[PDB]
Design a protein around this ligand. Structure first.
Ligand SMILES: O=C(O)Cc1c[nH]c2ccccc12
Ligand SMILES: O=C(O)Cc1c[nH]c2ccccc12
Lengths: 104, 105
């Protein structure tokens, strides 16, 4: 369905709400309140997922671990690897270049 | 030790992994790469949840929105309100007071 004014209005509000979170967390990092903020805003399993996703991204970029090793060690099965690979390919070049510098 | 070795070894790995994420995002903000990093690391529905949780926290601290309005505007039923309230109570007071300054003007 082509976006309607109702759906566009809701999407823009969600976008602004997201940016407000992003800026709140930016500020928290500047005031050394990011750790308690992240504990408030994210559940323990969500925090764990983020930690694991960094490893999945790292290992996809490194290219050394096999699919079976990614599944065993990171819990990342074939569909998770496909999605993570897609996210990497869709990322802007500046992000991919930086991730290569910092994670490898 | 608080935990047996198996559990402790898993917790230590998860802790390291969490700090790696925290540091990665810290540096992404400094490099203006936070938006694409968070798009990579979080699904659209997870990003939406975070945006909505900020509003729930804000409205809990503000005290003006009713229970019905929290549900109808922010999707937060009775149990969600209780959880969010509990998280706020457990947070350091320094964080709660900062959130009041920065979310409530
Ligand atoms: O697709 C998912 O299940 C969640 C997800 C979000 N960002 C990711 C990066 C790498 C691997 C998985 C994810
Ligand atoms: O408990 C939840 O459903 C998720 C959650 C994490 N932090 C929150 C802050 C306010 C409202 C909900 C949450």
């Amino acid at each position: 369905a082509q976006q309607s004014p109702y759906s566009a209005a809701m999407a823009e509000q969600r976008h602004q709400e997201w940016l407000r979170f992003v800026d709140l967390l930016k500020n928290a990092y500047q005031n050394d309140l990011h750790l308690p903020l992240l504990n408030l805003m994210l559940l323990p399993d969500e925090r764990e997922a983020l930690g694991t996703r960094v490893r999945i991204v790292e290992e996809l970029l490194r290219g050394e671990m096999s699919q079976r090793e990614l599944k065993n060690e990171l819990g990342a099965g074939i569909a998770t690897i496909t999605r993570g690979s897609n996210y990497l390919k869709a990322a802007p070049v500046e992000l991919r270049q930086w991730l290569e510098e910092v994670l490898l």
